[PDB]
Amino acid sequence: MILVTGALGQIGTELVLALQEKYGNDKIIASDLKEPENYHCKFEKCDIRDIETYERINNENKIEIVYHLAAILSAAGEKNPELCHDVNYNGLENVLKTAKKYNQKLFCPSSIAVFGPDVPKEMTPQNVELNPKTVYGITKVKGEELCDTYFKEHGIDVRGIRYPGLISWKHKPSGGTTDYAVEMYFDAVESGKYECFVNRNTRLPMMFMDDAIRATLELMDAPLDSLNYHSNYNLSSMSFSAEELEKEISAHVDFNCLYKPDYRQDIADTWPISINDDDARKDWGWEPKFDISKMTEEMITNLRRLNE
């Protein structure tokens, strides 16, 4: 059996489906804080910080693999640093201890947020110093370190990816730092108007969800002896600025974009532009398939459909 925490989030929504297709619908348990009505997969509600419920779920269900996507992201974390630490650090510790107890295999992601401006912004290498300027970033470095401790000291096969910004249509914008990319598609198609919350030159590493979900599954499938990294593989597809995305979208759809930055700018400004993921490409055969063209075709085709 396979458990997905944070199953209702941007990533979890699509990861559950992909795991159901790969393993069988019967092998996947979704978990998150609240049970939604008419949900399409077996669901166990849980606050990730609640170890006795979390324990019970893993005990009662015979979970052997956990994809741990529960998290407070960067923007929410700058606003509420206490909550961001509690969920991201203590939640992760609950997953780790439980994996040790039940001998589980784990996927515990990180983020390009581990990086600060003291290391290269272009093609950030795998092994640079990690000095993040965000609350979330700091939680992610601590998480990488916990995971690698569990690997070293307790022999837990835990694996992870430093996810870049992820673009999808199947989940609605979650108010997050990278979410200007998603919001721009939705508002372009729905109303022909978008107010972007970062400036027009804001440039981040980005990836279409299909590629990120595939990378996750591929990494989890790899022979353990092939991996030279565990919790924290850099992973890359695209890097583009907000105006470059506007221009790509405008080739399909008339829309007027206005730039009005807010506090999220100051998060995005402390992050790299692009990421060197050679270790992922080498160790376990990573290659993305969605460039900005193909991504924007999927996004616009599907958003148009939803707005008929």
* CA 243 vs CA 184, 249, 304: distances in Å: 10, 10, 21
Is residue 219 within 8 Å of residue 159, measured between CB atoms?
A: yes
**Class of domain 1-308 as given by CATH:** alpha beta
| Residue/partner pairs of 222-229 with CB below 8 Å, 24 or more apart | 222/283, 222/284, 222/285, 224/157, 226/283, 226/284, 227/159, 227/283, 227/284, 228/279, 228/283, 229/126, 229/279, 229/283
Coil vs helix vs strand at 34 = coil
Per the CB < 8 A criterion, the answer to whether 33 and 67 are in contact is no
Whether 29 and 43 have beta carbons less than 8 Å apart is answered as yes
Closest by alpha carbon to 14, among 28, 34, 35, 33?
A: 28
Listed resolution, Å = 1.9
> By C-alpha distance, which of 299, 308, 291 is closest to 184?
299
Q: How many CB atoms lie under 10 A from the CB of residue 236?
A: 25
DSSP 8-state class, residue 263: T
Residue 297 neighbours by CB under 8 Å, 6+ apart: none
The three-state secondary structure class of 66 is strand
Distance CA 236, CA 282 (A): 13
For the annotated binding site for NAD(+), the residues are 10-11, 32, 47-48, 71, 136, 140, 166
Method: X-ray
What lies within 8 Å, CB to CB, of 247 at 6+ separation is: none
Q: Where are the beta strands (DSSP E) in the chain?
A: 2-5, 28-32, 42-45, 65-68, 105-107, 110-111, 158-159, 161-163, 165-167, 193-196, 203-208, 233-234, 238-241, 256-259
End-to-end CA distance of the chain: 39
State both tokens at 243: 């105006």
Q: How far apart are CA 237 and CA 291, in angstroms?
A: 7
Task: Report the binding-site residues.
Answer: 10-11, 32, 47-48, 71, 136, 140, 166
Quick one: tokens of 42? 């077996």
Contact 161, 110 (CB under 8 A): yes
Half-sphere exposure of 169 (CA within 13 A, CB side): 19
Q: Collapsing DSSP states into helix, strand and coil, what is residue 237?
A: coil
Task: To the nearest 10°, report the CA torsion of 183, 186, 190, 196.
Answer: 20
For strand 28-32 and strand 105-107, is the pairing parallel, antiparallel, or unpaired? Answer: unpaired
Active site residues: 136
Distance set, CA 256 to CA 73, 147, 168, 199, 251 (Å): 29, 44, 21, 15, 12
The span from the CA of 116 to the CA of 202, in Å, is 15
In angstroms, the CA 134 to CA 82 distance is 13
Question: What tokens were used for 246?
Answer: 């506007």
